[PDB]
Amino acid sequence: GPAVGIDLGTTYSCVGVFQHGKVEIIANDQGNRTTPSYVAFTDTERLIGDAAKNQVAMNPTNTVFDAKRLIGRRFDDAVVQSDMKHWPFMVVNDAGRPKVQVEYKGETKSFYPEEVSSMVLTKMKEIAEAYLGKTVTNAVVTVPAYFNDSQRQATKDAGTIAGLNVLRIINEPTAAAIAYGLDKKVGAERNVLIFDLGGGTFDVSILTIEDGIFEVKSTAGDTHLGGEDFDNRMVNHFIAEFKRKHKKDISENKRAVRRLRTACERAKRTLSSSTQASIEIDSLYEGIDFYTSITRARFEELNADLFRGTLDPVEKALRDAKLDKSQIHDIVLVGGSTRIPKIQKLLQDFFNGKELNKSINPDEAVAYGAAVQAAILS
Amino acid sequence: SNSPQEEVELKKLKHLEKSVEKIADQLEELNKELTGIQQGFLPKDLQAEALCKLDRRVKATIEQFMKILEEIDTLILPENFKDSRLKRKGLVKKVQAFLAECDTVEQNIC
Numbered sequence: 001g002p003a004v005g006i007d008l009g010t011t012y013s014c015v016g017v018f019q020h021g022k023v024e025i026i027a028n029d030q031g032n033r034t035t036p037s038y039v040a041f042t043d044t045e046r047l048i049g050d051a052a053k054n055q056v057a058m059n060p061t062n063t064v065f066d067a068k069r070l071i072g073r074r075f076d077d078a079v080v081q082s083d084m085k086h087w088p089f090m091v092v093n094d095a096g097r098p099k100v101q102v103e104y105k106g107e108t109k110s111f112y113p114e115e116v117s118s119m120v121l122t123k124m125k126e127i128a129e130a131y132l133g134k135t136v137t138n139a140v141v142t143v144p145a146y147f148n149d150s151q152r153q154a155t156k157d158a159g160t161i162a163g164l165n166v167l168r169i170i171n172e173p174t175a176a177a178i179a180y181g182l183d184k185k186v187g188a189e190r191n192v193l194i195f196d197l198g199g200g201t202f203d204v205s206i207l208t209i210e211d212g213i214f215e216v217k218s219t220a221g222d223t224h225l226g227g228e229d230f231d232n233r234m235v236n237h238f239i240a241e242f243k244r245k246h247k248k249d250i251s252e253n254k255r256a257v258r259r260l261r262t263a264c265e266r267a268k269r270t271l272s273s274s275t276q277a278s279i280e281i282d283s284l285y286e287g288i289d290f291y292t293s294i295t296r297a298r299f300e301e302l303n304a305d306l307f308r309g310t311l312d313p314v315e316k317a318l319r320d321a322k323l324d325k326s327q328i329h330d331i332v333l334v335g336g337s338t339r340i341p342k343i344q345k346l347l348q349d350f351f352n353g354k355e356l357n358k359s360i361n362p363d364e365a366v367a368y369g370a371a372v373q374a375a376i377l378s
Numbered sequence: 379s380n381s382p383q384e385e386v387e388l389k390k391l392k393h394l395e396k397s398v399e400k401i402a403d404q405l406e407e408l409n410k411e412l413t414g415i416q417q418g419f420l421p422k423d424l425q426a427e428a429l430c431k432l433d434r435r436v437k438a439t440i441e442q443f444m445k446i447l448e449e450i451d452t453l454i455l456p457e458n459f460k461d462s463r464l465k466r467k468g469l470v471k472k473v474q475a476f477l478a479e480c481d482t483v484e485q486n487i488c
């Protein structure tokens with residue numbers, strides 16, 4: 001088998017392969033190009049990806065996710081400590097290292113974050129294997145640029161456990177820059193800004209490419225910002241509208257809030273290519289039918305602070321890197337939320353009308369660059 | 379003035395009705411399993427273990443009903459699609475009556 005590029009994500013992972021002069025992003029057993037970074041443990045078995053995610057309501061305490069927030073960290077780490085209140089699975093202390101404590105096959109089992117990430121990597125390896133019809137041993141796995149050696153080593157270790165020969169571990173903004181062939185460009189040093197906005201985290205990295213050498217000049221962002229927050233504001237809007245029209249509070253019912261939330265995420269996606277989205281939810285709450293619509297302009301207003309807020313990390317990254325925005329040669333969009341036209345407008349306007357590298361699917365760009373790298377190292 | 383466009387939405391709803399019937403059958407089986415536990419010779423500890431395995435199966439049933447609701451909620455039917463709108467409302471009320479029966483079981487075991 002060939003060598004693949006795996007983007008090991010916080011919430012979603014993605015695998016690609018370079019073949020026939022092109023990058024193929026490999027769809028999983030459910031036809032999905034992205035697989036949730038979820039693992040579930042039960043009385044007789046272990047579930048990974050979509051299966052694990054779907055079975056969460058049934059097995060909340062034993063469904064592990066967000067391992068990327070724990071991998072390579074100490075128990076005392078700010079992120080580990082802050083996050084566990086939210087996580088339904090238990091996070092214990094094994095001599096200063098977090099472990100996920102779960103009930104598995106009729107016994108209490110404790111797993112390190114690399115053992116959890118190795119299960120996700122094993123699935124990504126299987127995804128590529130079913131598509132190619134060949135054994136897949138070699139892989140290039142991405143990590144965030146702010147990752148320290150311990151975090152980087154733990155990710156490499158998750159590879160080794162999964163049965164992978166980790167050819168190289170590369171930075172996510174380096175992989176996104178490789179995907180667009182920014183190193184192949186002719187001229188002097190190139191200052192590249194990678195704007196990465198997904199579902200839960202925001203990451204801005206500025207890199208300098210001089211004679212094919214990638215140097216991370218600065219990192220900034222928001223650990224807890226993404227598409228979920230945009231959904232939240234849409235939900236606030238609809239609940240308020242339901243209140244105005246019917247004088248009823250749907251927040252009382254969590255199944256009503258969930259149906260409205262699911263419709264909101266879908267309406268948000270429509271608003272990236274259309275200027276209006278319509279929603280029809282029968283018997284939403286207290287037998288009332290909620291038929292409504294939202295304009296792209298209204299969606300933008302609801303999230304105005306969050307969208308604008310994305311420029312603060314950008315200004316900060318420029319500051320640490322000691323650069324003027326006029327010094328930024330290339331802007332790369334990464335993450336599903338960078339599909340938002342307002343976000344695209346804010347970033348272009350900020351950089352005096354410079355065009356954005358957004359042709360490659362934002363969710364797949366990191367996997368894309370890692371698939372190009374894996375091919376080079378074969 | 380019945381349209382071919384409406385027949386596509388009615389087909390969607392027919393597929394979702396079948397899916398509702400199948401989950402409904404599971405609920406009936408869980409009700410029969412619950413009677414089994416109640417009327418059988420299990421001691422307190424094994425009764426607690428059995429009803430919890432049943433609790434997990436009833437949460438799964440609820441999740442399957444919630445995903446049916448979530449699929450129905452993708453439908454957009456204009457005012458003219460009267461037959462589609464009536465079928466959609468009837469199907470939603472039918473699932474909500476099933477979710478209420480799931481809750482009766484779920485809230486009172488394990």
Ligand SMILES: Nc1nc2c(ncn2[C@@H]2O[C@H](COP(=O)(O)OP(=O)(O)O)[C@@H](O)[C@H]2O)c(=O)[nH]1
Binds near residue numbers: 010228270340363
């Ligand atoms: N508005 C909008 N958001 C999108 C679109 N496609 C994906 N997203 C959002 O992107 C988010 C997921 O981000 P992603 O890059 O896949 O990865 P993550 O950072 O690991 O969560 C979700 O909140 C989606 O709603 C789209 O077409 N429009």
Ligand SMILES: Nc1nc2c(ncn2[C@@H]2O[C@H](COP(=O)(O)OP(=O)(O)O)[C@@H](O)[C@H]2O)c(=O)[nH]1
Binds near residue numbers: 389
């Ligand atoms: N209302 C409506 N129902 C249809 C139409 N075409 C098919 N159906 C029925 O709706 C269901 C959808 O099934 P389908 O995918 O077409 O075929 P099947 O999988 O072989 O049953 C079946 O009961 C069909 O007989 C249509 O034009 N309108």
